[PDB]
Write a protein that binds this ligand. Structure first.
Ligand SMILES: *[C@@H]1O[C@H](CO)[C@@H](O[C@@H]2O[C@H](CO)[C@@H](O)[C@H](O)[C@H]2NC(C)=O)[C@H](O)[C@H]1NC(C)=O
Ligand SMILES: *[C@@H]1O[C@H](CO)[C@@H](O[C@@H]2O[C@H](CO)[C@@H](O)[C@H](O)[C@H]2NC(C)=O)[C@H](O)[C@H]1NC(C)=O
Ligand SMILES: *[C@@H]1O[C@H](CO)[C@@H](O)[C@H](O)[C@H]1NC(C)=O
Ligand SMILES: *[C@@H]1O[C@H](CO)[C@@H](O)[C@H](O)[C@H]1NC(C)=O
Lengths: 49, 49
């Protein structure tokens, strides 16, 4: 059975807060197609010979 | 068939007669005389704009 995710629990209370003291500059990628290959066909040359 | 006949380097086996492409159309053929081996290629063609 696939592991749905890493189990975690955050300590919540009604008078406590958590504030970062440091940062981290991260770089991520993302690939997106734009245009495929333009194609054309010949009717008679294909249907006939 | 209509096409251009050129010298071919294909090493036919002695019993082999034709040569077929992906579309099962005779690509390389053996002439009855001289037992020569040829290539059959459609003549130059294309689109006009
Ligand atoms: C700030 O303090 C709170 C409580 O004093 C921390 O919350 C606990 O964290 C431990 C970590 O091992 C857990 O085992 C406890 O279950 C948490 N408490 C509760 C009530 O769930 C909190 O982690 C602290 N902050 C940081 C950044 O460590
Ligand atoms: C915030 O994080 C950075 C990197 O995680 C800390 O910079 C490191 O500091 C230690 C000790 O000064 C060095 O040995 C490392 O080489 C540093 N890393 C880099 C990438 O420069 C930085 O110290 C953290 N902020 C604070 C306030 O401690
Ligand atoms: C936070 O919740 C507890 C009950 O879990 C309650 O007793 C307490 O009064 C709350 N805090 C405040 C500031 O009201
Ligand atoms: C026909 O071609 C073959 C192949 O070279 C040759 O051996 C034969 O003599 C030819 N016969 C005639 C009648 O041209």
């Amino acid at each position: 059975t696939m592991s749905l995710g890493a189990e975690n629990s955050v300590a919540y209370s009604n008078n406590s807060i958590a504030i970062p003291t440091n940062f981290t500059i991260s770089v991520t990628t993302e690939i997106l197609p734009v245009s495929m290959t333009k194609t054309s066909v010949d009717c008679t040359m294909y249907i006939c010979g | 068939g209509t096409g251009v006949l050129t010298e071919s380097n294909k090493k036919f086996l002695p019993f082999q007669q034709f040569g077929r492409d992906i579309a099962d159309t005779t690509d390389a053929v053996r002439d009855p005389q001289t037992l020569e081996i040829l290539d059959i290629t459609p003549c130059s063609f294309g689109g006009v704009s």
